[PDB]
Design a protein around this ligand. Structure first.
Ligand SMILES: CN1CCN(c2ccc(OCc3ccccc3)c(C(=O)Nc3cccnc3)c2)CC1
Ligand SMILES: [Cl-]
Ligand SMILES: [Cl-]
Length: 263
């Protein structure tokens, strides 16, 4: 039984749907991340099925799972570097070359997900982890879902995620395309990395900071802290109409995205 093989040392944090712990094996001392859930059978079955699909250098590794009656045990690679959240200095961000590198890696992982028809739905720095060489890994598949199957796209029609990161259409439209929503959250992550603050509580008209952006007041914070090149990218990403929003193929052609900054 689980408790005979593993010791739960501490809480690593909460995901969208549960909580994950640092587990250390009682024989080998191998340290792993474990998500423990007392079975929704329907959602957890879904989370496990997506987890089994994943194989990419910028997505967390899934080791497997154990069911002990009603409780499911999900085992995954521990991120020795902790989270990206912890590299963002409040009100400062991080050095632009470090931000660009992490943004390159984030885009690599998101392209991989979208290419297998999965949308993450909750991209934010808490869910972006780092291995021992600071390679970024997209974690937490509790909200992830299928948006393309047999080459047919399905629109999403459920609101979820985290408000300061969600795209405006998720709050307004009854159904919407999955990919532009993930692209938007990437832009908020990039903003956070370069300014060390979030731009708004949510992207709604009742939020003044979001109105300010739409009116192009980039002389205000956080935008004033961001160099003109990454800012120009952020103007293409944080576009209100998802059909006019930049796609990942075009992000990959952006001037800042291609600027040499780092060894
Ligand atoms: C030295 N230590 C190393 C470990 N350090 C650390 C800190 C936070 C973490 O996750 C926050 C989290 C993010 C999403 C959901 C729940 C919790 C993880 C981690 O490895 N988590 C993980 C791994 C695989 C799958 N899911 C989560 C590791 C902190 C510094
Ligand atoms: Cl398919
Ligand atoms: Cl933050």
């Amino acid at each position: 039984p689980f408790v005979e093989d593993w010791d739960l040392v501490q809480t690593l944090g909460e995901g969208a749907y549960g909580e994950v712990q640092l587990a250390v094996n009682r024989v080998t001392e191998e340290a792993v991340a474990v998500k423990i859930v007392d079975m929704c059978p329907e959602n957890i079955k879904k989370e496990i099925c997506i987890l089994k699909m994943l194989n990419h250098e910028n997505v967390i590794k899934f080791y497997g799972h154990r069911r002990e009656g009603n409780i499911q045990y999900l085992f995954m690679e521990l991120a020795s570097g902790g989270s990206l959240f912890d590299r963002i200095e409040p009100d400062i961000g991080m050095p632009e070359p470090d931000a660009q590198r992490f943004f390159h890696q984030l885009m690599a992982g998101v392209v991989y997900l979208h290419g297998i028809g999965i949308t993450h739905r909750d991209i934010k720095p808490h869910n972006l982890l780092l291995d021992e060489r600071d390679n970024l890994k997209i974690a937490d598949y509790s909200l992830a879902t299928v948006f393309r199957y047999n080459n047919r796209e399905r629109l999403l029609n459920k609101m979820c995620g985290t408000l300061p990161y969600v795209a405006p259409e998720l709050l307004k439209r009854r159904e919407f395309h999955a990919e532009p929503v993930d692209v938007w959250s990437c832009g908020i992550v990039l903003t956070a990395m370069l300014a060390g603050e979030l731009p708004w509580d949510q992207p709604s008209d009742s939020c003044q900071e979001y109105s300010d952006w739409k009116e192009k007041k980039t002389y205000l914070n956080p935008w004033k802290k961001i160099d003109s090149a990454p800012l120009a990218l952020l103007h293409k990403i944080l576009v209100e109409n998802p059909s006019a929003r930049i796609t990942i193929p075009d992000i990959k052609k952006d001037r800042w995205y291609n600027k040499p900054l780092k060894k």
